[PDB]
Amino acid sequence: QTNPYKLMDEAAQKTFDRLKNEQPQIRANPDYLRTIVDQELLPYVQVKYAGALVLGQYYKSATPAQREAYFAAFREYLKQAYGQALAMYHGQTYQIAPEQPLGDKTIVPIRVTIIDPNGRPPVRLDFQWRKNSQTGNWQAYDMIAEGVSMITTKQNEWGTLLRTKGIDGLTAQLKSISQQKITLE
Amino acid sequence: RTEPTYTLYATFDNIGGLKARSPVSIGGVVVGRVADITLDPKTYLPRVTLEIEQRYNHIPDTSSLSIRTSGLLGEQYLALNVGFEDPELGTAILKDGDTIQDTKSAMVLEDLIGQFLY
Amino acid sequence: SIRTEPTYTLYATFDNIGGLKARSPVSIGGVVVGRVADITLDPKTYLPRVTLEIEQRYNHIPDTSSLSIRTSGLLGEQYLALNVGFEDPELGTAILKDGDTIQDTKSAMVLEDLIGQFLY
Amino acid sequence: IRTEPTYTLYATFDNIGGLKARSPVSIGGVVVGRVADITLDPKTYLPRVTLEIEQRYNHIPDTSSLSIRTSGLLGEQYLALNVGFEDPELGTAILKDGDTIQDTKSAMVLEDLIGQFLY
Amino acid sequence: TEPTYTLYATFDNIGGLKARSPVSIGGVVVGRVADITLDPKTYLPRVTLEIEQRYNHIPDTSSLSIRTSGLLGEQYLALNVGFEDPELGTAILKDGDTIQDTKSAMVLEDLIGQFLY
Amino acid sequence: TEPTYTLYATFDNIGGLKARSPVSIGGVVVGRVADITLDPKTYLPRVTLEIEQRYNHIPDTSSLSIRTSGLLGEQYLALNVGFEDPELGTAILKDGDTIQDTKSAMVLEDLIGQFLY
Amino acid sequence: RTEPTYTLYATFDNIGGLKARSPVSIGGVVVGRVADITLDPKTYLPRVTLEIEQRYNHIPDTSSLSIRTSGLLGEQYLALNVGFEDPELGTAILKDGDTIQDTKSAMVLEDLIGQFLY
């Protein structure tokens, strides 16, 4: 079973299923979004091949005592962003793209959408699923908003820190984002 | 001029206004120019063939290639981004005649100004 | 002429052609194929209609596709642009031969209206 | 000869902006005439305008509208017509020779909006 | 070519008004501006202009403002007629008179500085 | 011939003020600019002002600032008359004196920085 | 221009649309011209070499260097900024063959829209 379409289908269903079960408790306690994002999603996403890009050539210099700390703090950072992101829930659709034959490459872009009558015109969010060698099943490693990436803006922004400070600089400073929500829902 | 040239291929799906013989640059300095642009009769997807000099020739494949604009009323060009080398996961320095795997779409105006501020 | 170039014709209607002229480019994915030919009106309803041509090498387009006019850069030419649709084999689709009409269409952009609906 | 015989019409306004003579008139983006004269009423100081239409098109109900809008983003100005609908029994008056439109809209100026809002 | 008559006015910030620039009412051109000068007692700008004579029913309650045409085009001064009512003295205009109230120009920098507080 | 004289003042960031630029007051030109230079120590720019003689009698307290013209014009050093007061607002600007208060120019990235971040 | 001028080196990361023979300005007055720009084949980073007039020769070793646009639609030009000079403590002056360290970088019309609400 390597068809990504069926995986995305079941993923959307399970996500909105587990999401529908809570309405007042989540806004009474934000500690549930950071939980449910780990309850699912994360088995489908890859961390190594993602967190390797933001480093750059400096990867060839990282000591084995430093790599694991960054690799551990990266997930703890990644949770909060997607946690805060989930602040909408208007019962919106998700019309998947139609089927297509054998992929002619080990890299494939797939597109979804989202529509609701209560909001602005819709928007598309491409995804990328990578066809690895012998991993059998495949994972996703990126997201594209709309002509804008999410690994591009951060590949160079955390820049001069790499030149002057080092990996040690990015460590700890990554986790130092606290645990918060918004009071404007 | 010295011309020990390499050639490479890439595919897209929307290229804005990138006409022929435009420059290509890394980090802000020029290293080559596009050559031949065409369309594909099997599925209709634009395909570009570019060429590189021989002085710089140590790029690992895990790299990106995007399109952007210059100034406020200038001409578009192709920016590049270098990655990392690591065994098993991603090796194979580019040999002549290969294709760049990654790509990113073109930035369109009007669309976003209609989207936001609605 | 541009040396031979056998072609065929298509028709369409609209609602506000903006500032389009004659002999304007038609393109797909930023690559030009054919040019426009004639524009006129309807003395029974007053709705603008356009007749364009297309070079005859490309011979595979689904019946369900979109047409839309737009602008380039931020202050230049206005050009048409079409988008191929997805074909379903087992169902009923069709190709486009000489003397057909495209189903749907899009309008055009204009100032004043938006800048007065918002931030007024 | 520029064109065949035509026929004329009049209208009034409140502020015509920078509209000069020899300006086009169009529907749906296609031009169908020109502009004749612009003058002032020496009794109430209100600007009026007189224009003409070619003899080809000969069926427009009375209920219609006229407005002003800028060309492109940074260009000239051109009048813009807008047709009503066809409804017998109710609105019948065909545009004859030398009549006046009922409803009209005014022009737009820059620095006024800045004071109006976003100040 | 007409027999014209002249009027005076004072201001506060000329905003780059160049001599020989049209005077308009409701968007229609009428008179021309004659010249601008300074005062050696108050240091304030004064302007002398002239008008055609056929139009002659503009009362006292009226306004003069400065405004620019197009986006970044030229600039001029717009006259504004005021509503007239009975009882009160209408006071018709004659040669060699002055306007009372008015308005001043606009400067860019201050608007930006106000948008950021 | 302009029977003029000279004035001196300081700044810190002159933007893009080439020589031969007006010294307008209330949108009226009444002078010019001759020399700009830099002191070989503290590294702070200074200028040389020249104004004509009829407009004398200026209180020693005033203001002076830099401004741009329209949207994409040039730059013109502008003045702002202060105030005249008895006793503790005395005297005038004699030949070759120094101006007190200033107001630096304006740059782009400062704005974008105050915004966003 | 017979007067001797002494040269300095610097490194950046994303210079943008800079071009050779452009002015260096302090406070608003021009002083020196830019000489050469290139890359390094070991790590790929933009490197610049510039020349400075000999009269001005009393700089503290702490300073700032950054590029920024001109007017509103103008080109690019470097911008130097004098740092803090401390007595007693060691500071000294900038001699030949040295390099300035901490520098900023350019900005192109895409990362702005990007960072705008991500």
JSON list of N, CA and C in Angstrom, two decimals, chain C residues 77-120:
[
{"chain": "C", "resi": 77, "resn": "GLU", "atom": "N", "xyz": [0.31, 45.27, -21.35]},
{"chain": "C", "resi": 77, "resn": "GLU", "atom": "CA", "xyz": [-0.66, 44.64, -22.22]},
{"chain": "C", "resi": 77, "resn": "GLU", "atom": "C", "xyz": [-1.65, 43.79, -21.43]},
{"chain": "C", "resi": 78, "resn": "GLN", "atom": "N", "xyz": [-2.83, 43.59, -22.01]},
{"chain": "C", "resi": 78, "resn": "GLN", "atom": "CA", "xyz": [-3.84, 42.70, -21.46]},
{"chain": "C", "resi": 78, "resn": "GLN", "atom": "C", "xyz": [-3.98, 41.54, -22.42]},
{"chain": "C", "resi": 79, "resn": "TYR", "atom": "N", "xyz": [-3.86, 40.32, -21.90]},
{"chain": "C", "resi": 79, "resn": "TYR", "atom": "CA", "xyz": [-3.87, 39.14, -22.75]},
{"chain": "C", "resi": 79, "resn": "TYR", "atom": "C", "xyz": [-4.82, 38.08, -22.21]},
{"chain": "C", "resi": 80, "resn": "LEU", "atom": "N", "xyz": [-5.37, 37.28, -23.13]},
{"chain": "C", "resi": 80, "resn": "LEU", "atom": "CA", "xyz": [-6.19, 36.14, -22.76]},
{"chain": "C", "resi": 80, "resn": "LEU", "atom": "C", "xyz": [-5.33, 35.03, -22.20]},
{"chain": "C", "resi": 81, "resn": "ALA", "atom": "N", "xyz": [-5.96, 34.09, -21.50]},
{"chain": "C", "resi": 81, "resn": "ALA", "atom": "CA", "xyz": [-5.27, 32.92, -20.99]},
{"chain": "C", "resi": 81, "resn": "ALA", "atom": "C", "xyz": [-6.29, 31.82, -20.71]},
{"chain": "C", "resi": 82, "resn": "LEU", "atom": "N", "xyz": [-6.01, 30.63, -21.23]},
{"chain": "C", "resi": 82, "resn": "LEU", "atom": "CA", "xyz": [-6.90, 29.49, -21.08]},
{"chain": "C", "resi": 82, "resn": "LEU", "atom": "C", "xyz": [-6.26, 28.48, -20.15]},
{"chain": "C", "resi": 83, "resn": "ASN", "atom": "N", "xyz": [-7.10, 27.60, -19.60]},
{"chain": "C", "resi": 83, "resn": "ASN", "atom": "CA", "xyz": [-6.66, 26.54, -18.71]},
{"chain": "C", "resi": 83, "resn": "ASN", "atom": "C", "xyz": [-7.34, 25.25, -19.12]},
{"chain": "C", "resi": 84, "resn": "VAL", "atom": "N", "xyz": [-6.54, 24.22, -19.36]},
{"chain": "C", "resi": 84, "resn": "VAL", "atom": "CA", "xyz": [-7.02, 22.89, -19.71]},
{"chain": "C", "resi": 84, "resn": "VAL", "atom": "C", "xyz": [-7.77, 22.31, -18.52]},
{"chain": "C", "resi": 85, "resn": "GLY", "atom": "N", "xyz": [-8.83, 21.55, -18.80]},
{"chain": "C", "resi": 85, "resn": "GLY", "atom": "CA", "xyz": [-9.56, 20.85, -17.78]},
{"chain": "C", "resi": 85, "resn": "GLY", "atom": "C", "xyz": [-9.24, 19.36, -17.78]},
{"chain": "C", "resi": 86, "resn": "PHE", "atom": "N", "xyz": [-9.81, 18.65, -16.81]},
{"chain": "C", "resi": 86, "resn": "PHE", "atom": "CA", "xyz": [-9.59, 17.22, -16.71]},
{"chain": "C", "resi": 86, "resn": "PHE", "atom": "C", "xyz": [-10.68, 16.46, -17.45]},
{"chain": "C", "resi": 87, "resn": "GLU", "atom": "N", "xyz": [-10.26, 15.47, -18.23]},
{"chain": "C", "resi": 87, "resn": "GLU", "atom": "CA", "xyz": [-11.16, 14.68, -19.06]},
{"chain": "C", "resi": 87, "resn": "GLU", "atom": "C", "xyz": [-11.49, 13.38, -18.35]},
{"chain": "C", "resi": 88, "resn": "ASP", "atom": "N", "xyz": [-12.74, 12.93, -18.51]},
{"chain": "C", "resi": 88, "resn": "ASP", "atom": "CA", "xyz": [-13.15, 11.64, -17.97]},
{"chain": "C", "resi": 88, "resn": "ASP", "atom": "C", "xyz": [-13.46, 10.71, -19.13]},
{"chain": "C", "resi": 89, "resn": "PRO", "atom": "N", "xyz": [-12.73, 9.61, -19.30]},
{"chain": "C", "resi": 89, "resn": "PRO", "atom": "CA", "xyz": [-12.87, 8.80, -20.51]},
{"chain": "C", "resi": 89, "resn": "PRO", "atom": "C", "xyz": [-14.21, 8.08, -20.57]},
{"chain": "C", "resi": 90, "resn": "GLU", "atom": "N", "xyz": [-14.51, 7.37, -19.48]},
{"chain": "C", "resi": 90, "resn": "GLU", "atom": "CA", "xyz": [-15.70, 6.52, -19.42]},
{"chain": "C", "resi": 90, "resn": "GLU", "atom": "C", "xyz": [-16.99, 7.33, -19.55]},
{"chain": "C", "resi": 91, "resn": "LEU", "atom": "N", "xyz": [-16.95, 8.61, -19.19]},
{"chain": "C", "resi": 91, "resn": "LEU", "atom": "CA", "xyz": [-18.12, 9.47, -19.34]},
{"chain": "C", "resi": 91, "resn": "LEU", "atom": "C", "xyz": [-18.12, 10.14, -20.71]},
{"chain": "C", "resi": 92, "resn": "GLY", "atom": "N", "xyz": [-18.97, 11.15, -20.87]},
{"chain": "C", "resi": 92, "resn": "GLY", "atom": "CA", "xyz": [-19.09, 11.84, -22.14]},
{"chain": "C", "resi": 92, "resn": "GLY", "atom": "C", "xyz": [-18.33, 13.14, -22.22]},
{"chain": "C", "resi": 93, "resn": "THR", "atom": "N", "xyz": [-17.20, 13.13, -22.93]},
{"chain": "C", "resi": 93, "resn": "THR", "atom": "CA", "xyz": [-16.44, 14.34, -23.20]},
{"chain": "C", "resi": 93, "resn": "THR", "atom": "C", "xyz": [-16.29, 14.52, -24.70]},
{"chain": "C", "resi": 94, "resn": "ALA", "atom": "N", "xyz": [-15.59, 15.57, -25.12]},
{"chain": "C", "resi": 94, "resn": "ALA", "atom": "CA", "xyz": [-15.41, 15.83, -26.55]},
{"chain": "C", "resi": 94, "resn": "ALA", "atom": "C", "xyz": [-14.21, 16.72, -26.80]},
{"chain": "C", "resi": 95, "resn": "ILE", "atom": "N", "xyz": [-13.63, 16.62, -28.00]},
{"chain": "C", "resi": 95, "resn": "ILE", "atom": "CA", "xyz": [-12.56, 17.52, -28.41]},
{"chain": "C", "resi": 95, "resn": "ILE", "atom": "C", "xyz": [-13.19, 18.71, -29.12]},
{"chain": "C", "resi": 96, "resn": "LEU", "atom": "N", "xyz": [-12.37, 19.68, -29.52]},
{"chain": "C", "resi": 96, "resn": "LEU", "atom": "CA", "xyz": [-12.89, 20.90, -30.13]},
{"chain": "C", "resi": 96, "resn": "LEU", "atom": "C", "xyz": [-12.36, 20.98, -31.56]},
{"chain": "C", "resi": 97, "resn": "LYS", "atom": "N", "xyz": [-13.26, 20.91, -32.53]},
{"chain": "C", "resi": 97, "resn": "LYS", "atom": "CA", "xyz": [-12.87, 21.06, -33.93]},
{"chain": "C", "resi": 97, "resn": "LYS", "atom": "C", "xyz": [-13.38, 22.40, -34.46]},
{"chain": "C", "resi": 98, "resn": "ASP", "atom": "N", "xyz": [-13.12, 22.65, -35.74]},
{"chain": "C", "resi": 98, "resn": "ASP", "atom": "CA", "xyz": [-13.40, 23.95, -36.34]},
{"chain": "C", "resi": 98, "resn": "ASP", "atom": "C", "xyz": [-14.87, 24.32, -36.21]},
{"chain": "C", "resi": 99, "resn": "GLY", "atom": "N", "xyz": [-15.13, 25.49, -35.64]},
{"chain": "C", "resi": 99, "resn": "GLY", "atom": "CA", "xyz": [-16.49, 26.02, -35.54]},
{"chain": "C", "resi": 99, "resn": "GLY", "atom": "C", "xyz": [-17.23, 25.67, -34.27]},
{"chain": "C", "resi": 100, "resn": "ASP", "atom": "N", "xyz": [-16.58, 25.79, -33.12]},
{"chain": "C", "resi": 100, "resn": "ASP", "atom": "CA", "xyz": [-17.20, 25.49, -31.84]},
{"chain": "C", "resi": 100, "resn": "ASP", "atom": "C", "xyz": [-17.16, 26.71, -30.92]},
{"chain": "C", "resi": 101, "resn": "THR", "atom": "N", "xyz": [-17.78, 26.56, -29.75]},
{"chain": "C", "resi": 101, "resn": "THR", "atom": "CA", "xyz": [-17.86, 27.62, -28.76]},
{"chain": "C", "resi": 101, "resn": "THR", "atom": "C", "xyz": [-17.51, 27.07, -27.38]},
{"chain": "C", "resi": 102, "resn": "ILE", "atom": "N", "xyz": [-16.77, 27.87, -26.60]},
{"chain": "C", "resi": 102, "resn": "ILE", "atom": "CA", "xyz": [-16.38, 27.46, -25.27]},
{"chain": "C", "resi": 102, "resn": "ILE", "atom": "C", "xyz": [-17.51, 27.76, -24.29]},
{"chain": "C", "resi": 103, "resn": "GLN", "atom": "N", "xyz": [-17.72, 26.85, -23.34]},
{"chain": "C", "resi": 103, "resn": "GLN", "atom": "CA", "xyz": [-18.88, 26.95, -22.45]},
{"chain": "C", "resi": 103, "resn": "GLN", "atom": "C", "xyz": [-18.79, 28.18, -21.55]},
{"chain": "C", "resi": 104, "resn": "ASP", "atom": "N", "xyz": [-17.95, 28.13, -20.53]},
{"chain": "C", "resi": 104, "resn": "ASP", "atom": "CA", "xyz": [-17.92, 29.14, -19.48]},
{"chain": "C", "resi": 104, "resn": "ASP", "atom": "C", "xyz": [-16.93, 30.24, -19.84]},
{"chain": "C", "resi": 105, "resn": "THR", "atom": "N", "xyz": [-16.79, 31.20, -18.92]},
{"chain": "C", "resi": 105, "resn": "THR", "atom": "CA", "xyz": [-15.94, 32.36, -19.11]},
{"chain": "C", "resi": 105, "resn": "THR", "atom": "C", "xyz": [-15.82, 33.15, -17.81]},
{"chain": "C", "resi": 106, "resn": "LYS", "atom": "N", "xyz": [-14.92, 34.12, -17.80]},
{"chain": "C", "resi": 106, "resn": "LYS", "atom": "CA", "xyz": [-14.68, 34.98, -16.65]},
{"chain": "C", "resi": 106, "resn": "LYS", "atom": "C", "xyz": [-14.76, 36.44, -17.09]},
{"chain": "C", "resi": 107, "resn": "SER", "atom": "N", "xyz": [-14.93, 37.34, -16.13]},
{"chain": "C", "resi": 107, "resn": "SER", "atom": "CA", "xyz": [-15.04, 38.76, -16.43]},
{"chain": "C", "resi": 107, "resn": "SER", "atom": "C", "xyz": [-13.68, 39.44, -16.43]},
{"chain": "C", "resi": 108, "resn": "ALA", "atom": "N", "xyz": [-13.65, 40.73, -16.13]},
{"chain": "C", "resi": 108, "resn": "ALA", "atom": "CA", "xyz": [-12.41, 41.48, -16.09]},
{"chain": "C", "resi": 108, "resn": "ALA", "atom": "C", "xyz": [-12.29, 42.26, -14.78]},
{"chain": "C", "resi": 109, "resn": "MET", "atom": "N", "xyz": [-11.12, 42.83, -14.54]},
{"chain": "C", "resi": 109, "resn": "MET", "atom": "CA", "xyz": [-10.85, 43.62, -13.35]},
{"chain": "C", "resi": 109, "resn": "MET", "atom": "C", "xyz": [-11.05, 45.09, -13.68]},
{"chain": "C", "resi": 110, "resn": "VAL", "atom": "N", "xyz": [-11.38, 45.89, -12.66]},
{"chain": "C", "resi": 110, "resn": "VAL", "atom": "CA", "xyz": [-11.58, 47.32, -12.83]},
{"chain": "C", "resi": 110, "resn": "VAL", "atom": "C", "xyz": [-11.36, 47.99, -11.48]},
{"chain": "C", "resi": 111, "resn": "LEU", "atom": "N", "xyz": [-10.91, 49.23, -11.51]},
{"chain": "C", "resi": 111, "resn": "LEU", "atom": "CA", "xyz": [-10.68, 50.01, -10.29]},
{"chain": "C", "resi": 111, "resn": "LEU", "atom": "C", "xyz": [-12.04, 50.54, -9.83]},
{"chain": "C", "resi": 112, "resn": "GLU", "atom": "N", "xyz": [-12.01, 51.63, -9.06]},
{"chain": "C", "resi": 112, "resn": "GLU", "atom": "CA", "xyz": [-13.21, 52.34, -8.63]},
{"chain": "C", "resi": 112, "resn": "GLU", "atom": "C", "xyz": [-14.12, 51.47, -7.78]},
{"chain": "C", "resi": 113, "resn": "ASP", "atom": "N", "xyz": [-14.66, 50.40, -8.36]},
{"chain": "C", "resi": 113, "resn": "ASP", "atom": "CA", "xyz": [-15.64, 49.56, -7.69]},
{"chain": "C", "resi": 113, "resn": "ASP", "atom": "C", "xyz": [-15.12, 49.03, -6.36]},
{"chain": "C", "resi": 114, "resn": "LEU", "atom": "N", "xyz": [-13.95, 48.39, -6.36]},
{"chain": "C", "resi": 114, "resn": "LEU", "atom": "CA", "xyz": [-13.41, 47.79, -5.15]},
{"chain": "C", "resi": 114, "resn": "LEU", "atom": "C", "xyz": [-12.96, 48.87, -4.16]},
{"chain": "C", "resi": 115, "resn": "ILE", "atom": "N", "xyz": [-12.28, 49.90, -4.67]},
{"chain": "C", "resi": 115, "resn": "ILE", "atom": "CA", "xyz": [-11.75, 50.95, -3.79]},
{"chain": "C", "resi": 115, "resn": "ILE", "atom": "C", "xyz": [-12.88, 51.76, -3.19]},
{"chain": "C", "resi": 116, "resn": "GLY", "atom": "N", "xyz": [-14.09, 51.64, -3.73]},
{"chain": "C", "resi": 116, "resn": "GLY", "atom": "CA", "xyz": [-15.25, 52.28, -3.16]},
{"chain": "C", "resi": 116, "resn": "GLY", "atom": "C", "xyz": [-16.14, 51.37, -2.34]},
{"chain": "C", "resi": 117, "resn": "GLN", "atom": "N", "xyz": [-16.07, 50.07, -2.58]},
{"chain": "C", "resi": 117, "resn": "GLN", "atom": "CA", "xyz": [-16.78, 49.11, -1.74]},
{"chain": "C", "resi": 117, "resn": "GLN", "atom": "C", "xyz": [-16.05, 48.94, -0.42]},
{"chain": "C", "resi": 118, "resn": "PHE", "atom": "N", "xyz": [-14.72, 48.97, -0.46]},
{"chain": "C", "resi": 118, "resn": "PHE", "atom": "CA", "xyz": [-13.91, 48.84, 0.74]},
{"chain": "C", "resi": 118, "resn": "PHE", "atom": "C", "xyz": [-13.15, 50.13, 1.00]},
{"chain": "C", "resi": 119, "resn": "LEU", "atom": "N", "xyz": [-12.78, 50.33, 2.27]},
{"chain": "C", "resi": 119, "resn": "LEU", "atom": "CA", "xyz": [-11.96, 51.47, 2.68]},
{"chain": "C", "resi": 119, "resn": "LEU", "atom": "C", "xyz": [-12.57, 52.80, 2.25]},
{"chain": "C", "resi": 120, "resn": "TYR", "atom": "N", "xyz": [-13.89, 52.84, 2.12]},
{"chain": "C", "resi": 120, "resn": "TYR", "atom": "CA", "xyz": [-14.55, 54.06, 1.67]},
{"chain": "C", "resi": 120, "resn": "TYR", "atom": "C", "xyz": [-14.91, 54.95, 2.85]}
]
